[PDB]
Amino acid sequence: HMSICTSEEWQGLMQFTLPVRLCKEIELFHFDIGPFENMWPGIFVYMVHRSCGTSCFELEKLCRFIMSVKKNYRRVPYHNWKHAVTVAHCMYAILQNNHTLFTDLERKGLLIACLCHDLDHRGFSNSYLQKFDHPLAALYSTSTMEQHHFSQTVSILQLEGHNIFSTLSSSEYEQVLEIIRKAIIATDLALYFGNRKQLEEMYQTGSLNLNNQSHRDRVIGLMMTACALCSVTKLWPVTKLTANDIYAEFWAEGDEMKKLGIQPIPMMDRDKKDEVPQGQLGFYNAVAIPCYTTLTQILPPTEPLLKACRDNLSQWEKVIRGEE
Ligand SMILES: Nc1ncnc2c1ncn2[C@@H]1O[C@@H]2COP(=O)(O)O[C@H]2[C@H]1O
Ligand SMILES: [Mg+2]
Prior knowledge:
By secondary structure, the chain is mainly alpha-helical. It has a single domain (1-324), classed as Orthogonal Bundle (Catalytic domain of cyclic nucleotide phosphodiesterase 4b2b). Helix content is 65%, strand content 0%. It is built from 15 helices and no strands. It has helices spanning 7-13, 20-25, 40-52, 59-71, 81-96, 104-116, 126-131, 135-139, 144-157, 170-186, 189-205, 213-228, 236-259, 276-298, 303-321. The longest helix has 24 residues, at 236-259. The chain is globular. Magnesium ion binds next to loops. Residues 189, 228-229, 231-232, 243, 246, 280, 283 line the site of adenosine-3',5'-cyclic-monophosphate.
């Protein structure tokens, strides 16, 4: 059912070595993978090797897994292969800066979860799928696309020579699949609001306990949100270019809605592009800023993400003022 990489693809990835200059730059939170397209698969291998060890996964299986995942991301403007590696890199930076706070199993599970969090995304939102009673919406009632992403991830692991997790004990195998399932589902932004509220209460009252599994799950959920939204933590030019991709995809969804007799919300209406700056301002105030603020309280080393987010919020305000 899943698309499979060619022998040339996975065998070639096995020979990749990250350039020395990038080895330094990749550790920074603001790192933009954008100008290194041919290196994206290799960049992911590198991050897994540094965070989990060069022998954590059998190289051949890891390369097949990565290239088949790439092949199963579609040609959509935003939720594509580039996005997958970008989100995985943000997780890499978070994990690197909070290394011993997370178990070996959690680090490997989370890096894989990020690479696969939007696997086989079709360019359509959950709102579209549920508003048009799409098959996927009947099965996966809530977090529709996210449940599909997890199912597709398991499907790729089931491909011959692709199960990088088979060497784990039966207990840890089940454990990592659960970590991955919860992490991918957490990228359904609808769940973010309640999760952040709960974490803020736990933090403020002092009940937050990282040794409490239910609490760990929530912190990991917030981390996934922070990574999924990380385009807002890059340098302004990069943030602005990515925003163009985000809207390109949403406008295409809006176009399809119009064709079917349903008017899209302003955000997905390309004829309302002038409202984008205010739309982003609202998003930063309602989602981004609160997200990174809570993340930084829980994990101090992630402060750079919050600083960058605040900087971009100021940039959007500048646009609104006419200082673009
Ligand atoms: N700059 C942004 N980056 C990411 N998501 C955004 C942004 N602005 C608005 N959003 C909304 O937040 C959602 C985050 O997850 P999605 O990418 O599924 O869909 C995104 C949009 O609905
Ligand atoms: Mg998604």
